[PDB]
Design a protein around this ligand. Structure first.
Ligand SMILES: O=C(O)C(=O)C[C@]1(C(=O)O)C=C[C@@H](O)C=C1
Ligand SMILES: O=C(O)C(=O)C[C@]1(C(=O)O)C=C[C@@H](O)C=C1
Ligand SMILES: O=C(O)C(=O)C[C@]1(C(=O)O)C=C[C@@H](O)C=C1
Lengths: 114, 119, 118
C-alpha cells in the first residue's frame, strides 16, 4: 500500500525566511513521527493560502538531506470564509504498511486546532 | 495497482449546506460503483473553482462513516474562460485490481457535460 | 513501487493552441524518456500559473492515443511574487520499478531554469 500523510502549519509574516522555516519545521516533524525514508515517497504536494506570496513552500524540501529526488509541486489552497489565514498544508504519499488509522498527521503553529 | 478515480459535481449556490450535501452525494456514488473501502484509499483531493468560499468540500468526508481516517486536502481549480462554474471535482487514489478501462468515474449535476465518454 | 514524475514548460501567450501544443509536447517527452504506457499511470495533475485562462491543459491529454482512461485533473499554481510566468507543470504518478534518482523529470522552454538538476 502507499498512503497519504497530511500536515499543516501557519506562518506569522509572509516572508521567504518565515515560509521556508515553518515549512521545513513541518516536514521534519512528519518525517520524525512516521519514520519516512526519502525513497519511499512517491510524491508530495504542498498548498498555500492565497495571502502567501513571497516563496514557494516546496523550496523547503530541498533543505532536507537526501530529498533531492522526491517529486514535489505546489498548488493553491481554496479561499474559504473563516478559514485559517497564512496556512501551508502538505500531502505526502509514501509506501507503507502502517494502518490508515495509525498514520501520524502533523498539525503545527496555529493549525494545532486540528 | 493503485489507480485514481475521478468525479465531478456542481452546486447552484455557495453555501455550506449545499456544498456538503452535493460533495457527500458524489463520494457515495463513486464508493458504490467502485466498491471502495476507506482503507484502500491512499488519499483524496478535492478542488473547487474560485467562486466557492463557504466551506471546504472536504468536510463532507467525515460524514461518511469509516472515512474519518482518509487523508484529504482541497485546492483551487484554475480559472479558465468558459470552464464549468461552482464545480467541485475529486481525485480519489485507490488500491484496486480493476483495470483502467473499467474504473467507473462519476459525473453528477451540470458536470455530466465534462466527460460524456465516461458515462 | 509507484513513483511521481514532474514536468514543467512555458507558453509565450495565453492561447488554447499554444497551451495544448506545449503541454502535448511535454507529456510526449515524459512518456518517451520514462517509457510510460498509459495503463501504468495511476493519475496525473496539471497546474498552471494564475495568468493562463484559455483552456485547461488536461485537454492536451486527448491527443495522446490510448490515454482516454488516464484520470487527470488540474489545479492552480500558487502565485508567488517573481515566480516563472505562464507555466504549466505536471505531476504524473506511474507504476514503476525505476529508482527514484533515475526517473527522468522533464523541464522544457523557459522552465529549464526551475530545477537545473533533474
Ligand atoms: O520544479 C518546479 O516545478 C519548480 O518550480 C520548483 C518547485 C520546487 O521548489 O521544487 C516550486 C514550485 C512548484 O510548484 C514545484 C516545485
Ligand atoms: O486538515 C486541514 O488542514 C483542514 O483544514 C481540514 C480540511 C477539511 O475540512 O476537511 C480543509 C481544508 C484542507 O484543504 C483539507 C482538509
Ligand atoms: O473531468 C473533468 O472534470 C473536466 O473538467 C475535464 C478535464 C480534462 O480535460 O480532462 C479538464 C479540466 C479539469 O481540471 C479536469 C479534467
Amino acid at each position: 500500500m502507499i498512503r497519504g500523510i497530511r500536515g499543516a502549519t501557519t506562518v506569522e509574516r509572509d516572508t521567504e525566511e518565515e515560509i521556508l522555516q515553518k515549512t521545513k519545521q513541518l516536514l521534519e516533524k512528519i518525517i520524525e513521527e512516521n519514520h519516512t525514508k526519502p525513497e519511499d515517497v512517491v510524491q508530495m504536494l504542498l498548498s498555500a493560502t492565497p495571502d502567501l506570496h513571497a516563496v514557494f513552500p516546496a523550496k523547503a524540501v530541498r533543505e532536507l538531506s537526501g530529498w533531492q529526488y522526491v517529486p514535489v509541486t505546489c498548488m493553491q489552497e481554496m479561499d474559504v470564509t473563516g478559514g485559517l489565514k497564512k496556512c501551508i498544508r502538505v500531502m505526502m504519499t509514501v509506501q507503507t504498511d502502517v494502518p490508515q488509522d495509525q498514520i501520524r498527521h502533523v498539525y503545527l503553529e496555529k493549525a494545532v486546532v486540528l
